[PDB]
Each structure stands twice: as structure tokens, then as C-alpha cells.
């Protein structure tokens, strides 16, 4: 019996499989940050913090003693509750193939929002700095949907100016993806040109990213550490409802702040 306590839930194994599949497909579809940054872990429930290898001096020390404190980045544990109907889960045992698992998708996208919002725009209460809020480069102000094929090159230029090599991925927020993929130049494709621009770089949709972003896929620049990977656990149940949660433990580090350029309002 681990912390997920799943054997205590009034849920048949096939209903557990259905819940897990729903969450898994949502996560594989929507986790923007995980498909860009470098990945450490998972290390389990007792991994508490990432060792940075840095030391910080302590001022009030005697003359005969040199003392320094080791610097570490603690992980955040995130739990998103959701509820399911017990009868809907029971129907799986009678051969039902489409039980109502709406709240599973809701909780999974809420977890995706939490993780990707931390990765891109930081999370100050967790001591995390995002990719966008840590870049020293000036944010290109894109004026219209047709300025993107220019802007990216400019951003890419900046990346190779500062010394950041490697394929450059384009990350599009909600409006940017909508406007640049609902567009067509009288038959001639535009998004095809967009992927043609980036040298074997991926183009990814991030629902939590405001605007757009161009960032290196070189590696060693952005680091997501996961202690406990995305899991479904059981909390409680009444006669008719069962309370579950999505759980994860993670932290994110910006190793090289200059490997990305932000593109403002699409």
C-alpha cells in the first residue's frame, strides 16, 4: 500500500484502467513543457530537492572558520482532486465502454496547466523561474499573423547571436496557434512555411504560454526534475461519489537563461 491507496477505492480493476487511459491520453496530448526541456527522474516519493552544486557564503562567521551553505532547489508536490460517480465506474464491469470520465480530463488538464505554467512563466511561491520570465533578450512584439515568418527568423538570429546553437523549436500559445493554423494564403499553406523555417525543430502548442516563444533544443539549458511522476490516487468516497486525485512532484531549473526569445501578443 503506497501513498496512492488505490486498493481502498470501491473501483473495479477495469474502471481503474479506463481512468488511467483517460488521464494518460490527456497528458500525452497536452504536456507542452515535457516535450521541450531536458528530463530528470522520476525518483519517487522521497526525492525532496535538486542539488545544484553551488555554495553560498555565510557572513557572520569567525575569523578562523570558513562556512558555506549548500544550495538546493526543493520540489513542489501538486495534487488536483476530482470526483467520479460510483455507478458509472460500476457500469464498466457490465461491459460499458464509455463511462462518464469528464472530471478525469478536467483534473488532468488542470495539472497540465500547473506544470506548464511553472515551466514557461515561472512559479514564484515554489521558487521556480520560467523560461519566458528569465530570458535576458528583448521580447519581439509581433504585430499580425503574417509577421510570424519574419519574427521567428529575427528571434532565431538573436539566439545564434548570443551563442545558442542547435535546432530552434517554436512554441505557440492558444491564440497564436489558433490564428496561425486557421490561416491559408489563397490555397498556399502558411504553417508549412512555419515548420520549414525552423531547422529540424519541433512546433508545439502550449495552452499555458502567453504569446509565442522560440527556444533552443540543444539540451542542457532547461531542466525539469520529477520525483513522483503523474499518478492517480484515491482520497475518499461516499455512497455515490469517489474522490480521486492527480499527483506529481517536480521542480524546474533554467540553467542557461539566454536560450529563448519571447514573442509578445500574437
Amino acid at each position: 500500500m503506497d501513498l496512492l491507496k488505490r486498493h481502498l477505492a470501491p473501483i473495479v480493476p477495469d474502471a481503474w484502467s479506463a481512468i488511467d487511459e483517460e488521464a494518460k491520453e490527456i497528458f500525452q496530448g497536452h504536456l507542452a513543457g515535457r516535450k521541450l526541456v531536458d528530463f530528470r527522474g522520476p525518483f519517487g516519493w522521497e526525492y525532496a530537492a535538486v542539488n545544484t552544486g553551488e555554495l553560498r557564503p555565510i557572513d557572520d562567521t569567525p575569523e578562523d572558520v570558513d562556512m558555506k551553505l549548500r544550495q538546493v532547489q526543493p520540489l513542489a508536490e501538486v495534487r488536483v482532486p476530482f470526483t467520479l460517480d460510483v455507478t458509472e465506474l460500476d457500469s464498466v464491469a457490465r461491459g460499458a465502454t464509455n463511462p462518464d470520465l469528464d472530471d478525469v480530463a478536467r483534473a488532468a488538464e488542470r495539472m497540465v496547466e500547473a506544470e506548464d505554467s511553472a515551466i514557461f512563466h515561472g512559479w514564484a511561491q515554489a521558487g521556480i523561474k520560467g523560461i519566458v520570465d528569465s530570458t535576458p533578450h528583448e521580447a519581439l512584439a509581433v504585430a499580425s499573423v503574417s509577421d510570424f515568418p519574419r519574427a521567428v527568423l529575427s528571434a532565431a538570429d538573436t539566439l545564434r547571436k548570443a551563442g545558442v546553437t542547435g535546432p530552434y523549436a517554436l512554441v505557440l500559445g492558444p491564440k497564436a496557434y489558433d490564428d496561425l493554423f486557421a490561416a491559408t494564403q489563397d490555397g498556399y499553406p502558411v504553417a508549412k512555411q512555419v515548420q520549414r523555417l525552423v531547422v529540424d525543430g519541433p512546433l508545439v502548442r502550449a495552452n499555458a504560454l502567453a504569446g509565442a516563444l522560440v527556444m533552443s533544443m540543444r539540451g542542457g539549458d532547461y531542466e525539469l526534475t520529477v520525483g513522483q511522476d503523474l499518478s492517480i490516487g484515491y482520497a475518499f468516497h461516499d455512497r455515490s461519489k469517489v474522490e480521486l486525485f492527480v499527483a506529481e512532484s517536480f521542480t524546474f531549473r533554467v540553467l542557461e537563461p539566454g536560450a529563448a526569445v519571447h514573442l509578445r501578443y500574437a
Partner: peptide
């Protein structure tokens, strides 16, 4: 006992 997502590259 996670969902086994891990890295998405």
C-alpha cells in the same frame, strides 16, 4: 505507481 509519462523529448 505512476502513469508512466516521463519525458516527451
Amino acid at each position: 505507481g505512476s502513469l508512466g509519462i516521463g519525458s516527451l523529448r
